[PDB]
Write a protein that binds this ligand. Structure first.
Ligand SMILES: O=C(O)CCCCCOc1ccccc1CN(C(=O)c1ccc(-c2ccoc2)cc1)C1CCCC1
Ligand SMILES: CCCCCCCO[C@@H]1O[C@H](CO)[C@@H](O)[C@H](O)[C@H]1O
Ligand SMILES: CCCCCCCO[C@@H]1O[C@H](CO)[C@@H](O)[C@H](O)[C@H]1O
Length: 263
C-alpha cells in the first residue's frame, strides 16, 4: 500500500511505545543532575527517580558492577519497548510467534544501540528518564571489562548523530533493523525479506521528503545497519568474556537467552 501511510503508522507506533524520544532528549540536552564520580552517583541513587528501584537491582557488589546493573536494567526495559513497538506493526504481528522471537533475539541490540544516540552527546548520556546525565569520562573510568563495553557505543553514537535523523526517520530505521531477513533460524525468510523491502522503500521515500538536501543519506543509513551488526558482534563477545571472568556479576536471564547462540 501507500508508503506515506505506512511510514506514518510506524511513526505513531514509535511515539506510542518509546517514553523517551529524540525530540525530548534533545530538548533536555540543550536540567539533569550530572553524575561524574562515586559521590554524585551516590547522591543520584538517593535523589533521582529510577524506573528500577536499587532495592531490586541484584544485591550490591561494587561501583563498576553497580553501573553495569543499571545499564542492564535500562537495556531490558528498552527490549520491552522494542517488543511492543514491533508488535504494533501489523506485518510483524502476522509472522508466526517463533519468527517474532527470532527477529527480536537477533535485532534488539542493533536497534537499541541505534536509539542510544538519541540520548547521547559527546560528553555523556541521559539516564533515569532524562533526570540524570552520566558523563562519558566517568564511564571511561570504570574498571575493565566494564569500561570497554561502553565506549564503543559512544563512538558509533556520535557519528550516527551527525546524520541528524529525527524520530520519524528513526521509527522506519529501527523497523528495518528488526524486520531483517538474514537472521539465523528464521522460518519464513521470503516473508520477512518482503516486509523489509517495503520498510526500506518507505524509508527512502521518507528521507526524500524529510531531508530534501541530504544526498547519500539513504545509502549512508544502509551502511550504519551493517556497522550495527559488527557493533553487536563485538558486544556479544564482550558479554561472553564478562560471563566467564566476572562470575560474581548477575546477568539478566532474558539477555543470556539473547546471547545463547551467538558467536
Ligand atoms: O546488553 C546487555 O547485556 C546489557 C549490558 C549493557 C552494558 C553496556 O551498556 C551501555 C553501553 C554504552 C552506553 C549505554 C549503555 C547502557 N544504556 C543506558 O541507557 C545506561 C547507561 C548508563 C546508566 C548509568 C546509571 C548510573 O550510572 C550509569 C544507565 C543506563 C543503554 C544502552 C542501550 C540500552 C540502554
Ligand atoms: C505460533 C507458535 C507455535 C509454536 C512454535 C514453535 C517454535 O519452535 C521454536 O522456535 C524458537 C524460535 O523462537 C527456536 O529457538 C526453537 O529452536 C524452535 O523449536
Ligand atoms: C522478549 C523478546 C526478546 C526475546 C529474545 C530471547 C530469545 O531467546 C530464545 O527464545 C527461544 C524460545 O523460547 C528459545 O528457543 C531460544 O533457545 C532462545 O535463544
Amino acid at each position: 500500500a501507500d508508503l506515506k501511510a505506512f511510514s506514518k503508522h510506524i511513526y505513531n507506533a514509535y511515539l506510542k511505545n518509546f517514553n523517551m524520544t529524540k525530540k525530548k532528549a534533545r530538548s533536555i540536552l540543550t536540567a539533569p543532575f550530572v553524575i561524574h564520580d562515586i559521590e554524585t552517583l551516590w547522591q543520584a541513587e538517593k535523589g533521582l527517580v529510577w524506573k528500577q528501584l536499587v532495592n531490586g537491582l541484584p544485591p550490591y557488589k561494587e561501583i563498576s558492577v553497580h553501573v553495569f546493573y543499571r545499564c542492564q536494567c535500562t537495556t531490558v526495559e528498552t527490549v520491552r519497548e522494542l517488543t511492543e513497538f514491533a508488535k504494533s506493526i501489523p506485518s510483524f504481528s502476522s509472522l508466526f510467534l517463533n519468527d517474532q522471537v527470532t527477529l527480536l533475539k537477533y535485532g534488539v541490540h542493533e536497534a537499541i544501540f541505534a536509539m542510544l544516540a538519541s540520548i547521547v552527546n559527546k560528553d555523556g548520556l541521559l539516564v533515569a528518564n532524562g533526570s540524570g546525565f552520566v558523563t562519558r569520562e566517568f564511564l571511561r573510568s570504570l574498571r575493565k571489562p566494564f569500561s570497554d563495553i561502553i565506549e564503543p557505543k559512544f563512538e558509533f553514537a556520535v557519528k550516527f548523530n551527525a546524520l541528524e535523523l529525527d524520530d520519524s526517520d528513526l521509527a522506519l530505521f529501527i523497523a528495518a533493523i528488526i524486520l531483517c531477513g538474514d537472521r539465523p533460524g528464521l522460518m519464513n525468510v521470503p516473508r520477512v525479506e518482503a516486509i523489509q523491502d517495503t520498510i526500506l522503500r518507505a524509508l527512502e521515500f521518507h528521507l526524500q521528503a524529510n531531508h530534501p538536501d541530504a544526498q547519500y543519506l539513504f545509502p549512508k543509513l544502509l551502511q550504519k545497519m551493517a556497522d550495527l551488526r559488527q557493533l553487536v558482534t563485538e558486544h556479544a563477545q564482550m558479554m561472553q568474556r564478562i560471563k566467564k571472568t566476572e562470575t560474581e556479576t548477575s546477568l539478566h536471564p532474558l539477555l543470556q537467552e539473547i546471547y545463547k547462540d551467538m558467536y
